[PDB]
PDB file of C-alpha atoms in Angstrom:
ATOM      1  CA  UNK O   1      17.693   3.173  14.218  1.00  0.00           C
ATOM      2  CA  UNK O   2      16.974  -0.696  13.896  1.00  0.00           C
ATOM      3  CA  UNK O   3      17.490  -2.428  10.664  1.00  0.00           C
ATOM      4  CA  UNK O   4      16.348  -5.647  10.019  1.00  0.00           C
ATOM      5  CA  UNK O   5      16.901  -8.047   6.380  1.00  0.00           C
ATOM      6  CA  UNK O   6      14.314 -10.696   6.917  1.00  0.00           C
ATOM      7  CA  UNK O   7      10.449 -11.460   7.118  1.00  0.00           C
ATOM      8  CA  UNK O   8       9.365  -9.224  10.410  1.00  0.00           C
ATOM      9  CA  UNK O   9       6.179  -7.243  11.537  1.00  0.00           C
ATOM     10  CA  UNK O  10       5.772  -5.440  14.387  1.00  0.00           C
ATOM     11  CA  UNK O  11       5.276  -1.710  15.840  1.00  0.00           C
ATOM     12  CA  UNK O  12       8.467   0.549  15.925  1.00  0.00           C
ATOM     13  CA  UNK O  13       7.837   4.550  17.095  1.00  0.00           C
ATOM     14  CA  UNK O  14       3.567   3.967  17.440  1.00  0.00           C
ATOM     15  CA  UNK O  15       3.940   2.649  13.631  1.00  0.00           C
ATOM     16  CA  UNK O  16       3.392  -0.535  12.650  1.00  0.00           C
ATOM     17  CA  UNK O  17       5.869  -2.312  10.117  1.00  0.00           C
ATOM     18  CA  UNK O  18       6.445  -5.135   8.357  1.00  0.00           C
ATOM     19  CA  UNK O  19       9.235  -6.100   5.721  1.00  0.00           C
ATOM     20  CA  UNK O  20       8.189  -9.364   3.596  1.00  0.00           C
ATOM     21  CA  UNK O  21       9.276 -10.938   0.460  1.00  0.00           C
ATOM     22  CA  UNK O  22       9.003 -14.663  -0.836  1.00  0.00           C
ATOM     23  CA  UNK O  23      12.848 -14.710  -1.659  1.00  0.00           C
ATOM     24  CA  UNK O  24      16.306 -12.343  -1.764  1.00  0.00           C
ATOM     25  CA  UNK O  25      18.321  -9.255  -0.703  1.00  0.00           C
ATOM     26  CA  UNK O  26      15.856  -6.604   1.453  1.00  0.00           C
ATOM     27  CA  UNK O  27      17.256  -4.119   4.125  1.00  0.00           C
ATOM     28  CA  UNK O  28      15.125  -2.123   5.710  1.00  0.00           C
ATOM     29  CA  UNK O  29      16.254   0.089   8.339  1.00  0.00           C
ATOM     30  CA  UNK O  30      13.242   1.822  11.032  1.00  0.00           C
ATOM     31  CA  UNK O  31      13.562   5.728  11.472  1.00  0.00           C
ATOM     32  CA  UNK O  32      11.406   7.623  13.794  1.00  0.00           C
ATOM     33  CA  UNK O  33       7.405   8.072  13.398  1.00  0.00           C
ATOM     34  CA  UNK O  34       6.456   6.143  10.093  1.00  0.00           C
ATOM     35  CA  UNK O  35      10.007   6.994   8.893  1.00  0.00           C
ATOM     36  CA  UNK O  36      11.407   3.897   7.519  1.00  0.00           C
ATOM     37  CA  UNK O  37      14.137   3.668   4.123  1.00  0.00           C
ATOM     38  CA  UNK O  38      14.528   0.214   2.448  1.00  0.00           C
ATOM     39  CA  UNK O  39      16.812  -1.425  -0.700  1.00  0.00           C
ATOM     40  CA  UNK O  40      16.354  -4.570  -2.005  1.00  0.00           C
ATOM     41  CA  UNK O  41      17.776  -6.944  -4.897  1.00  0.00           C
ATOM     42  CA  UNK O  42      17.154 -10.410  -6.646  1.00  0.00           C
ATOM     43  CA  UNK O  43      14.401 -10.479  -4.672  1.00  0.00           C
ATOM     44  CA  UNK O  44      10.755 -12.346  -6.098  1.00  0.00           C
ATOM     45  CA  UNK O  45       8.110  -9.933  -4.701  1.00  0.00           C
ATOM     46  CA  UNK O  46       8.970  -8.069  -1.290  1.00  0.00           C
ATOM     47  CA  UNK O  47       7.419  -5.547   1.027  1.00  0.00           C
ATOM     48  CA  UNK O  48       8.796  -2.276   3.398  1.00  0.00           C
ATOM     49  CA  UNK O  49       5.759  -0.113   4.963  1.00  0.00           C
ATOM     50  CA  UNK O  50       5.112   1.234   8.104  1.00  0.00           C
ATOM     51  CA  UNK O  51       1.031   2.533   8.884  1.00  0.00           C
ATOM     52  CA  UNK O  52      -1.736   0.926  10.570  1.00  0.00           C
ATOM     53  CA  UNK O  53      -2.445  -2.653  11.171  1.00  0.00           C
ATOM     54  CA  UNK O  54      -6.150  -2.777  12.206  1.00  0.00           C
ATOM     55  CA  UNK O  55      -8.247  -5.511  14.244  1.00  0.00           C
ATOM     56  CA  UNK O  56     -10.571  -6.577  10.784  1.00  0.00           C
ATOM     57  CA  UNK O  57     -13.158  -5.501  13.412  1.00  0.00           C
ATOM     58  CA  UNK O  58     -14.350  -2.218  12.037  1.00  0.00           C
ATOM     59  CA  UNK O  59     -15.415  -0.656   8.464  1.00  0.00           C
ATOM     60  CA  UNK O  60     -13.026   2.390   6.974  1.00  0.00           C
ATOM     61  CA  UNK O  61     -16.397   4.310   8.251  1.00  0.00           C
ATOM     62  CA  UNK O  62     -16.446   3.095  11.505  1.00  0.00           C
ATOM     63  CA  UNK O  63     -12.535   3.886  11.877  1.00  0.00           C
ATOM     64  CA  UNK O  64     -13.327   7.071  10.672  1.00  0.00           C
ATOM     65  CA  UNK O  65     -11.773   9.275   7.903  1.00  0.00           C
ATOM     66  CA  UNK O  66      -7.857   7.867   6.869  1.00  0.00           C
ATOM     67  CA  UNK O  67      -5.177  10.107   5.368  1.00  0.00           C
ATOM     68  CA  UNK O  68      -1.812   9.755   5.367  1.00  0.00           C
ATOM     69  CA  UNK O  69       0.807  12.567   4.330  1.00  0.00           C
ATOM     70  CA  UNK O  70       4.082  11.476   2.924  1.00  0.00           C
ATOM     71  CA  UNK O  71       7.842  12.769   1.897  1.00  0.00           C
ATOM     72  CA  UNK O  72      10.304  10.261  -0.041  1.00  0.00           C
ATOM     73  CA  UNK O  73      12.820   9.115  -2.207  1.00  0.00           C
ATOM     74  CA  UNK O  74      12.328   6.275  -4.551  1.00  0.00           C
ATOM     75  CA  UNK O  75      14.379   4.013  -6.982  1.00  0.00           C
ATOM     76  CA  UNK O  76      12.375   1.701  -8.653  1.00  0.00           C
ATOM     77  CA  UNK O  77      15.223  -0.048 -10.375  1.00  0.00           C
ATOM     78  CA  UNK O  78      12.191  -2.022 -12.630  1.00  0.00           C
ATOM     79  CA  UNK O  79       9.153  -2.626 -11.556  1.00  0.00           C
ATOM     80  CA  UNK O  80       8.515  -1.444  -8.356  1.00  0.00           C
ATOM     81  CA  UNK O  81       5.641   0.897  -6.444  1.00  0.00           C
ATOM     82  CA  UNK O  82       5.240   3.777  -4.180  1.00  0.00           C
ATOM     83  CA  UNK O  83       2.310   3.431  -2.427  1.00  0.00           C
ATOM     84  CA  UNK O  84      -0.706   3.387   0.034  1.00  0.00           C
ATOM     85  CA  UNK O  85      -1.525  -0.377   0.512  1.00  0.00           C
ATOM     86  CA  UNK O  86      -3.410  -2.997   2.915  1.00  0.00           C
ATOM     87  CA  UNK O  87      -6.106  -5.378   2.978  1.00  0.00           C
ATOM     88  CA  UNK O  88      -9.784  -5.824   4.529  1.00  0.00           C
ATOM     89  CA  UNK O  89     -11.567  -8.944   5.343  1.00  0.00           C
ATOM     90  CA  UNK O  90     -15.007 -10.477   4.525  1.00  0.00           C
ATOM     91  CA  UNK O  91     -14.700  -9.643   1.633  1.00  0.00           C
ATOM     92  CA  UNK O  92     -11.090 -10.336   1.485  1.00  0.00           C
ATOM     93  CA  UNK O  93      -9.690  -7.386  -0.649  1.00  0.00           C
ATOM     94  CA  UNK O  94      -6.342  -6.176  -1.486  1.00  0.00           C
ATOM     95  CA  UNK O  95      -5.901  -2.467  -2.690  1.00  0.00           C
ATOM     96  CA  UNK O  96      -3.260   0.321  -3.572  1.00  0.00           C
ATOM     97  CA  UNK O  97      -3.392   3.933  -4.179  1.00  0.00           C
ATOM     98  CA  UNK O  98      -0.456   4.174  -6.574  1.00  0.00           C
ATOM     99  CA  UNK O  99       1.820   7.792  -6.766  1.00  0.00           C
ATOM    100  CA  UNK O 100       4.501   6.306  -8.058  1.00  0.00           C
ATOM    101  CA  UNK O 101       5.745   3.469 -10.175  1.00  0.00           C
ATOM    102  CA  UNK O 102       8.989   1.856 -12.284  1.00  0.00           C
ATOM    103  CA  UNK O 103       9.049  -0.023 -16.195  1.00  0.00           C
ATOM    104  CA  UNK O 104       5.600  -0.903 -15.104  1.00  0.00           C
ATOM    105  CA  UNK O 105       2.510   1.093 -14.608  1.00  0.00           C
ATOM    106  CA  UNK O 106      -0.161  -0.884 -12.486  1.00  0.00           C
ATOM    107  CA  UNK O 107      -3.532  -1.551 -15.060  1.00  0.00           C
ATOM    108  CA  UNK O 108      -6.560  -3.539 -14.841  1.00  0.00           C
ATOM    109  CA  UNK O 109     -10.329  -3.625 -15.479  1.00  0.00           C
ATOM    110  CA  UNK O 110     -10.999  -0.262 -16.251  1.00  0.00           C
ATOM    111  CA  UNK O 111     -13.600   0.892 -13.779  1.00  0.00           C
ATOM    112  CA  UNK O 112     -13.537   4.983 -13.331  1.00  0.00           C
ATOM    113  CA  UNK O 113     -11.014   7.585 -12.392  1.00  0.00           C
ATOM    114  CA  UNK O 114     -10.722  10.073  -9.690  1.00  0.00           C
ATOM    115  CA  UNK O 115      -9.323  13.400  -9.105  1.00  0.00           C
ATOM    116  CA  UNK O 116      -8.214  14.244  -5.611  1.00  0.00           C
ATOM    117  CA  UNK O 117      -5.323  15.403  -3.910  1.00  0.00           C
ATOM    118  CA  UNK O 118      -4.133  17.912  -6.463  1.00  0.00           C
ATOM    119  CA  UNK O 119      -3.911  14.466  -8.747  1.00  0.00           C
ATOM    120  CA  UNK O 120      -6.124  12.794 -10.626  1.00  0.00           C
ATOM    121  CA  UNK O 121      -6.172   8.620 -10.447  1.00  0.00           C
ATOM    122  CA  UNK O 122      -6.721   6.088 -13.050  1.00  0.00           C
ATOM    123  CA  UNK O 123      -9.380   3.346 -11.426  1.00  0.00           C
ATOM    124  CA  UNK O 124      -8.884  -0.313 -12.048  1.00  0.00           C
ATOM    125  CA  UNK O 125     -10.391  -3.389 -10.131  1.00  0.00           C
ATOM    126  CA  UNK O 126      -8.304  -7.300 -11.156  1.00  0.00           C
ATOM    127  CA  UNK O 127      -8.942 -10.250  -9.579  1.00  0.00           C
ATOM    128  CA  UNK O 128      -6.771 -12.823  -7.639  1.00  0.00           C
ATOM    129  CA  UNK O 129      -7.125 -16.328  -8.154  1.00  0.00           C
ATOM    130  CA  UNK O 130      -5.461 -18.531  -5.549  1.00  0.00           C
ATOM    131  CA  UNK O 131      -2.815 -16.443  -5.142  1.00  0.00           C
ATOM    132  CA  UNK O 132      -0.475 -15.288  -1.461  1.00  0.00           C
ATOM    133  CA  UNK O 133      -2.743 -13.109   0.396  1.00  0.00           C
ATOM    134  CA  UNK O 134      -2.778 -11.968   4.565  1.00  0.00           C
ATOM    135  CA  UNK O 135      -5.020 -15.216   4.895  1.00  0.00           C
ATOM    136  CA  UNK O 136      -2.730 -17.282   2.614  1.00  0.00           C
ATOM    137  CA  UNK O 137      -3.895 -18.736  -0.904  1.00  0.00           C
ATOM    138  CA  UNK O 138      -7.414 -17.372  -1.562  1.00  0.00           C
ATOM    139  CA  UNK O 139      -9.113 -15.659  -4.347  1.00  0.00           C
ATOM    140  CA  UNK O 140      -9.846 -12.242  -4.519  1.00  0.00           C
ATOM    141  CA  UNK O 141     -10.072  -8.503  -5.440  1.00  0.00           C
ATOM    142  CA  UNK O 142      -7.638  -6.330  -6.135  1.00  0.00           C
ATOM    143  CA  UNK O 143      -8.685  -2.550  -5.980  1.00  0.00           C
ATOM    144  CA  UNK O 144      -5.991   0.076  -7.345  1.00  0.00           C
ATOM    145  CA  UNK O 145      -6.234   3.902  -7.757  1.00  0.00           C
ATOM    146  CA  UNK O 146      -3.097   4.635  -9.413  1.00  0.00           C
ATOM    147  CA  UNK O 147      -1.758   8.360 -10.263  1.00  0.00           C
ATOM    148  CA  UNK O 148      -1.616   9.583 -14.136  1.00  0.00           C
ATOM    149  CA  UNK O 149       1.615  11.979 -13.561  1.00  0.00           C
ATOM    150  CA  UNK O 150       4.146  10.292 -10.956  1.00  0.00           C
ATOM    151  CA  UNK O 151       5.018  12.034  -7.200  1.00  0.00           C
ATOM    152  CA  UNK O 152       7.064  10.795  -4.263  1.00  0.00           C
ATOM    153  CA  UNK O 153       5.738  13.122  -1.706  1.00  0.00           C
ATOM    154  CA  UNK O 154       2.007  14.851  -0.607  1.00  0.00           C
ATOM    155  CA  UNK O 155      -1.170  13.617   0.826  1.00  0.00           C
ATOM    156  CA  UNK O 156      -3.369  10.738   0.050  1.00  0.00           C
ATOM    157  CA  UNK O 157      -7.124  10.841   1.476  1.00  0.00           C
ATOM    158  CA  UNK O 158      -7.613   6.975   1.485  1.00  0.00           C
ATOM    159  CA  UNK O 159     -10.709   7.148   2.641  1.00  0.00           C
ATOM    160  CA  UNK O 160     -11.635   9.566  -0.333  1.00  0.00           C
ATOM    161  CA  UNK O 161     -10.272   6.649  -2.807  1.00  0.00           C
ATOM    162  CA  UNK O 162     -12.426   4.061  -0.674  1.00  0.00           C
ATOM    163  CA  UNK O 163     -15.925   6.202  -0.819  1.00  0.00           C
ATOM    164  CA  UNK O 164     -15.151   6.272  -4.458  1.00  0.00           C
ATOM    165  CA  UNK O 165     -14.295   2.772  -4.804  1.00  0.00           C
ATOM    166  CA  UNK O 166     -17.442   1.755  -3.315  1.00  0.00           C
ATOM    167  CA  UNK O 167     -19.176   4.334  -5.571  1.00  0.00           C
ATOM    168  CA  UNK O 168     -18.300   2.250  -8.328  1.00  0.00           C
ATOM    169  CA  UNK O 169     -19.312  -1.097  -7.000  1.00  0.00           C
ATOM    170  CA  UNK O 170     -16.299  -2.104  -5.356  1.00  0.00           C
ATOM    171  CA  UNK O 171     -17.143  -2.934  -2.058  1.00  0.00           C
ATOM    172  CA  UNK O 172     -14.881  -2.842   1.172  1.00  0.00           C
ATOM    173  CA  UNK O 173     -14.334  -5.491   3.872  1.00  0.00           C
ATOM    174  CA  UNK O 174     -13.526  -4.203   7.490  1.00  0.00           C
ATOM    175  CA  UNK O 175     -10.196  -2.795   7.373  1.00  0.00           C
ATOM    176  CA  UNK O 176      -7.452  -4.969   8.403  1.00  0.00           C
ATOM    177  CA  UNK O 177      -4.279  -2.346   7.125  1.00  0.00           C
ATOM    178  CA  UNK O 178      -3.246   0.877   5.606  1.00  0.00           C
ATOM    179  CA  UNK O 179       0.406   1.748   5.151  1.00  0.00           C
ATOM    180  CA  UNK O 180       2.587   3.863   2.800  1.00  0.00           C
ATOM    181  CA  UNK O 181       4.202   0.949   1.188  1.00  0.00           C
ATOM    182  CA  UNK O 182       6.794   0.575  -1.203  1.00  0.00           C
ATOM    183  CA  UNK O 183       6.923  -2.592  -3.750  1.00  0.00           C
ATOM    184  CA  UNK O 184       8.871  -4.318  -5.714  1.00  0.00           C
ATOM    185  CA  UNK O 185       8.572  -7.296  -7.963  1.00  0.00           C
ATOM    186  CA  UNK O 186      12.230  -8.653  -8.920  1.00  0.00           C
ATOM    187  CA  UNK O 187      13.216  -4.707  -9.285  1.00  0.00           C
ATOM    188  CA  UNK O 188      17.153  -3.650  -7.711  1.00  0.00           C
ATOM    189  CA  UNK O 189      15.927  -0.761  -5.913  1.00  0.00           C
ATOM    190  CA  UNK O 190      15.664   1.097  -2.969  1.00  0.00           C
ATOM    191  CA  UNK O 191      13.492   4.263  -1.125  1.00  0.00           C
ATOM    192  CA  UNK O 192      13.702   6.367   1.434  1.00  0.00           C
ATOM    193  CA  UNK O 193      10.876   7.698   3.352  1.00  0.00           C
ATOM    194  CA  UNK O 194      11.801  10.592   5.672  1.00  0.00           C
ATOM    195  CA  UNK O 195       8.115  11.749   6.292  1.00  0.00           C
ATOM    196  CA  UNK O 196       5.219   9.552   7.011  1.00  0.00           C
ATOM    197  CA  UNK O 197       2.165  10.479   8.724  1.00  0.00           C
ATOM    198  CA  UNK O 198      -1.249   8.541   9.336  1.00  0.00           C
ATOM    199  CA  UNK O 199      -4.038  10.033  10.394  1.00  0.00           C
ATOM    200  CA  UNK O 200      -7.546   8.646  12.183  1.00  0.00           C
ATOM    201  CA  UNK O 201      -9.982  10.571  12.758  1.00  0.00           C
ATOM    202  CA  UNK O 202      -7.253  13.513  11.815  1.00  0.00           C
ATOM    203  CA  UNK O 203      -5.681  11.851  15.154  1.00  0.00           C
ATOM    204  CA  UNK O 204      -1.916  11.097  13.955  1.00  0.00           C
ATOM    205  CA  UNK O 205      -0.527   7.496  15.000  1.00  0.00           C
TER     206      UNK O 205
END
């Protein structure tokens, strides 16, 4: 429907969206629901996801449980992600739930793994130090769940990857997003996402 090629957030169709990157080529063009396709190039590090963007008011147990199910089409081109992403706040905390990746498979501390959603996730917790964040430059956590076979289409129980996160001492902030996101980090690619549903409470958006 609407396709925009610079820094913009908003709500389009109940979804809320948000296309960002530091520097270069992005197109992202806003389909129905949390439908959304995107391409990019000579870019530095840039953003296309459509979900929830939350008040930082409320724990993931106060919002109740989060899952989102997902159908798409995905060309890394390098390094680039498919994924569930957002932030939370006090503590500030940046996580993904990784299904798919390019030349470069997300790693960190090791700190567990997880089998859910007919997958089964490699754990890893790295920190931030003064880096770009929702608040701007701050320190921080970085929390990633990230998928030992790739996929580019079923359901992800976020809240299931949160309860285990916290399991493991990794502690969550009150929930400022959640959004099937796709990544990139100076990758030439491009995805489409023709299904994209978020559920609250099993309540879709």
């Amino acid at each position: 429907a609407t396709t925009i090629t610079s820094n913009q957030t908003g709500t389009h169709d109940g979804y809320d969206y948000e296309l960002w990157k530091d520097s270069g080529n992005t197109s992202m063009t806003l389909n129905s629901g949390g439908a959304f396709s995107a391409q990019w190039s000579n870019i530095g590090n840039a953003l296309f996801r459509k979900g929830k963007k939350f008040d930082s008011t409320k724990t993931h147990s106060q919002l109740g449980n989060i899952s989102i199910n997902y159908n798409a089409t995905f060309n890394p081109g390098g390094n680039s992600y498919l994924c569930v992403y957002g932030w939370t706040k006090d503590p500030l905390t940046e996580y993904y739930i990784v299904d798919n990746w390019g030349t470069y498979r997300p790693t960190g501390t090791p700190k567990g793994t997880f089998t859910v959603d007919g997958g089964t996730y490699d754990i890893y917790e790295t920190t931030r130090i003064n880096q770009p964040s929702i608040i701007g430059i701050a320190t921080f956590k970085q929390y990633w769940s990230v998928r030992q076979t790739k996929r580019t289409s079923g359901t992800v129980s976020v809240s299931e990857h949160f309860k285990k996160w916290e399991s493991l001492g990794m502690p969550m902030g009150k929930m400022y997003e959640t959004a099937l996101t796709v990544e990139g980090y100076q990758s030439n690619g491009s995805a489409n996402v023709t299904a994209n549903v978020l559920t609250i409470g099993g309540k879709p958006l």
